[PDB]
Design a protein around this nucleic acid. Structure first.
Lengths: 386, 136, 62, 224
RNA sequence: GCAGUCAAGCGUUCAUAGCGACAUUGCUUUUUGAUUCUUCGAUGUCGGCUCUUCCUAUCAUACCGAAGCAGAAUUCGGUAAGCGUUGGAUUGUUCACCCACUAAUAGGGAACGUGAGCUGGGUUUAGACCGUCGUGAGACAGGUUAGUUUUACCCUACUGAUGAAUGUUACCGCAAUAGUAAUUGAACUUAGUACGAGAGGAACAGUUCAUUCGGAUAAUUGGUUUUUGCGGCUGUCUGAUCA
């Protein structure tokens, strides 16, 4: 028998299987395509998601209905500590894909990547990299041997970085190590760049910029085990149904005498690796930059932190990317921001924008005020000090 | 939305499905309308075609002059009372629902329109805008 | 960019904050949040709601 | 020359445009064939200003005024008002108008001499209208229609009115307005004639559905 | 039910743009028959709701060929199911015909899919009514009403979740394999141009939005509320208060 009314499926068979991610750090599966002409730089960046806020900007889209007119839209603020390099690693192209042939670590690693290797830091003898730090006693014949082998071989060059988790209002103290590919020409130049930038700050005023489309890779918010209505979208059954009205009703035909892989079942919803492309950056704000939240129309001295801090996160005194729209991943997750794979000639990209108003009212209620000086103006003096 | 309308309207919220009786807000003689489908609407299994502000609906008349009764006629929604989002920031909603009878090109069968008219309707339908009173 | 004043309490309304209401006589009302709106749809008199502005402006509060 | 013009499919020029003696206000969302009929015969006579009013494109029915004034409603923003202040010359008088009864273009059907408005507008706004425009404001409805802006196009030479109108009210408005009136239609007999075309002393742009017997009566009564 | 081959004639003329008589070769198993090999120490027996997958004899979409294709609309066909195929009234419906939108309202299979998934309107136990037939008990190829639908805690399949061992342990990765996803319309423009005697009247590229789907989020908006968080109110009980 045919379906008697034919409908679009529930859910998407390409985001299968829906098991949980490896860890909270989402692997970047692929990096932008390399051309050996650009100056040497990074491809991705690691940060932490601080929440959302509201942006009033002048839409400038010729031929639209709101041309040169104010709109409001949502942005996510993703926090940015200056990410610091602690090593490089080169891969040789083999007939079974790229294979890491050697890796080189820096000289004096910070205690955060020394905290990353230990499940039990407090018991430990804290002996991370001791017999590797002893390899700098001579002029460095082993280490320069390793770098000459990376120069001779290894068509691609990736760099082990980590975030500086202590500069964050988090409470974790452990840094997430990662790899980042490079875009410059002539891999000797890449690895000399890496050897120069061992243990050096790399801030986002060099990797990203204003108005540019970036992809964002993170792990989904976790909602645990889940039933098949809210997971897949399947119709609830009527009121009258014995044995469960929030289900898939029919599992399948008689023959195939097995349950198909494409029917909707109950399982894990959330905590998957997701990737969302073409997100526009509206601000690249800086930590030493006082008054992040002023604008050329606004001009009042305030940060992008809401009154009373971001909910569940803290207060941004750090750099930040401020990116249009939503983003996969909730607050306090390691979010990886990546340069675009293709050049985006679409006129939704390449729209050079500047903001007009950043919302910094309290996200913890219905925020009636943006700055506390404004509240002391409006609400007036109280039963406190005077 | 649909053929014969002038301009493109950004998506505003659908709060009037098949069967909604709206307080007909012109002097044409109809006292109320009754949505029977929406021009330009799409198809999904067990989904009612819903109307919104400014959209053209086929509708009938359940009251009024008995010349106007018992016949399917085009109509145009001018108030919604389900809150839709303008791009400039606001979510906004009228006191009630409303509608005016039209021809398939957009002319008012009546002459005058009473009360408010939402501007996302008046910009899409020109003939309504001229007979309109309060815009927004 | 305009800072709209409220219709019920008297607070200030940032862009994208609260609803807009058009009563059928086309007198448009703006509401700060869900609170002052849902009080206004009870037809409360804002001159006798003790935390609003037209209350405090009338009894000379500060 | 009653030039026939589409606004991209439609033939009511009075919706998307406001034609006066010193200024011409037009919508922004149009092609060159909508503006060639204006810019060929006008050329270097009056400034044509591309703008919007109150977040719409119906600025012919939103604002209403004469050679001396341009009255703007509530929802017109700061940037639109500043661009119209810098674009239009200093002879016109622009004023924000507070009324919740209609839009201003549907209410006011006026010229340089005599205004006819909606009968339900109050006294404080009427004093503002007669102050800014400098026009003795009168209060009348044509053929029962309370919107005189939709069924009456007015100029200093003459005027086109609602097609189903008795001769007695035509003679009363000919004694009041001191102009001769002839009841006619526009755009293959469309009854909405207050928006079907614009007119001033030099130009009267009509719609493409206007045939020759309607156009001859229009160019006879407005005396181009 | 579908498709050929031949081809008398229609089609202004002209067998084959499209059709096609008289004949004739087949395919299919979504009909119904014929048989009765399996099941009567019992595979739960109509319809709908739900949900996945598959075929193609394609309705729409993509790209093209032919015309009695000027344009527009159509008609015949080729690769192709990749993706989509509806909301309603009456009826238990399958089918059905209607209203209305739509780009389109294609056809089917999977134990005439799917009852330890549902509902139980129909059929088909026992009650009862009417008509007809019967001498009667009762029969109905007919109408109407009222009528209980049980179990998963096994193996497997599927979806999710851990896991001993290849020196231990941790971090950073590669990729075999397996899945995949986007879809479609409207308006403006080209443009009352091309094409046309006129009536009528497009397309290619561009711009702005939208339909169905999919994944995410929660600033704002709405919903939920045991923050029983704050305020109010009834009845009673703490002697009244306060709580």
């Amino acid at each position: 028998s045919h379906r008697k009314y034919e409908a679009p499926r529930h859910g998407h068979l390409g985001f299968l299987p829906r098991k949980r991610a490896a860890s909270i750090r989402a692997r970047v599966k692929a990096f932008p395509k390399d051309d050996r002409s650009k100056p040497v730089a990074l491809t991705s960046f690691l940060g932490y998601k601080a929440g959302m806020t509201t942006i009033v900007r002048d839409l400038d889209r010729p031929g639209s209905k709101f041309h040169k007119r104010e709109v409001v839209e949502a942005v996510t603020v993703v926090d940015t500590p200056p990410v610091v390099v602690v090593g490089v690693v080169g891969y040789v192209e083999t007939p079974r894909g790229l294979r890491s042939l050697t890796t080189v670590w820096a000289e004096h690693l910070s205690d955060e990547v020394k905290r990353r290797f230990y499940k039990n830091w407090y018991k430990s003898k804290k002996k991370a990299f001791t017999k590797y730090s002893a390899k700098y006693a001579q002029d460095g014949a082993g280490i320069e041997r390793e770098l000459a082998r990376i120069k001779k071989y290894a068509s691609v060059v990736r760099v082990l970085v980590h975030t500086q988790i202590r500069k964050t209002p988090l409470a974790q103290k452990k840094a997430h190590l990662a790899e980042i590919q490079l875009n410059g020409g002539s891999i000797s130049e890449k690895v000399d760049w890496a050897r120069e930038h061992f243990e050096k700050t790399v801030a986002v005023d060099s990797v990203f910029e204003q108005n540019e489309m970036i992809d964002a890779i993170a792990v989904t918010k976790g909602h645990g085990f889940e039933g098949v209505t809210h997971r897949w979208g399947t119709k609830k059954l009527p009121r009258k149904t014995h044995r469960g009205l929030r289900k898939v009703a029919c599992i399948g035909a008689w023959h195939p005498a097995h349950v198909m892989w494409s029917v909707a079942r109950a399982g894990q919803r959330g905590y998957h690796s997701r990737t969302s492309i073409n997100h526009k950056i509206y601000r690249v704000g800086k930590g030493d930059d006082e008054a992040n939240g002023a604008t050329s129309f606004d001009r009042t001295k305030k940060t992008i932190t809401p009154m009373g801090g971001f909910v569940h996160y803290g207060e941004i005194k750090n750099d930040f990317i401020m990116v249009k729209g939503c983003i996969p991943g909730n607050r306090k997750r390691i979010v990886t921001l990546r340069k675009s794979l293709y050049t985006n000639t679409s006129r939704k990209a390449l729209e050079e924008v500047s903001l007009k108003w950043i919302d910094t009212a309290s996200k913890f209620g219905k925020g009636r005020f943006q700055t506390p000086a404004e509240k002391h103006a409006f609400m007036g003096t109280l039963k406190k000090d005077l | 939305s649909g053929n014969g309308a002038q301009g493109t309207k950004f998506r505003i919220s659908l709060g009037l499905p098949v069967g909604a009786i709206m307080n007909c807000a012109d002097n044409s003689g109809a006292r109320n309308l009754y949505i029977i489908a929406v021009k330009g609407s799409g198809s999904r299994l067990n989904r009612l075609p819903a109307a919104s502000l400014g959209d053209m609906v086929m509708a009938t008349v359940k009251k009024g002059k008995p010349e106007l009764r018992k016949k399917v006629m085009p109509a145009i929604v001018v108030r919604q009372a389900k809150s839709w989002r303008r791009r400039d920031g606001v979510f906004l909603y009228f006191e009630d629902n409303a509608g005016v009878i039209a021809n398939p090109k957009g002319e008012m069968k009546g002459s005058a329109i009473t009360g408010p008219v939402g501007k996302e309707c008046a910009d899409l339908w020109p003939r309504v805008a001229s007979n309109s009173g309060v815009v927004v | 960019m305009k800072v709209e004043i409220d219709s019920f309490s008297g607070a200030k309304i940032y862009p994208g904050r609260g609803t807009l209401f058009v009563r059928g006589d086309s007198k448009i009302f703006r509401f700060q949040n869900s609170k002052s709106a849902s009080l206004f749809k009870q037809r409360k008199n804002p001159r006798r709601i003790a935390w609003t502005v037209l209350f405090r402006k009338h009894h000379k509060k500060g | 020359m009653a030039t026939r013009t589409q606004f991209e499919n439609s033939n009511e020029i009075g919706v998307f445009s406001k034609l006066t003696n010193t200024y011409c206000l037009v919508a922004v969302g149009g092609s060159e064939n909508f503006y060639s009929a204006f810019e060929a015969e006008l050329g270097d006579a009056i400034p044509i200003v591309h703008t919007t009013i109150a977040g719409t494109r119906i600025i012919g029915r939103m604002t209403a005024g004469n050679r001396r004034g341009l009255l703007v409603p509530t929802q017109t923003t700061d940037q639109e008002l500043q661009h119209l202040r810098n674009s239009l010359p200093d002879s016109v008088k622009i004023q924000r108008v507070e009324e919740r009864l209609s839009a201003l273009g549907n209410v006011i059907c006026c010229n340089d001499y005599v205004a006819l408005v909606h009968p339900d507008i109050d006294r404080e706004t009427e004093e503002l209208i007669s102050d800014v425009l400098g026009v003795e404001v009168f209060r009348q409805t044509i053929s029962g229609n309370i919107l005189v802006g939709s069924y009456c196009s007015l100029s200093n030479q003459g005027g086109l009115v609602h097609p189903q109108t008795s001769v007695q009210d035509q003679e009363e408005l000919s004694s009041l307005l001191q102009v001769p009136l002839v009841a006619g239609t526009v755009n293959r007999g469309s009854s909405v004639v207050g928006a079907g075309m614009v007119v001033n002393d030099y130009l009267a742009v009509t719609g493409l559905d206007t045939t020759a017997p309607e156009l001859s009566v229009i160019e006879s009564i407005f005396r181009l």
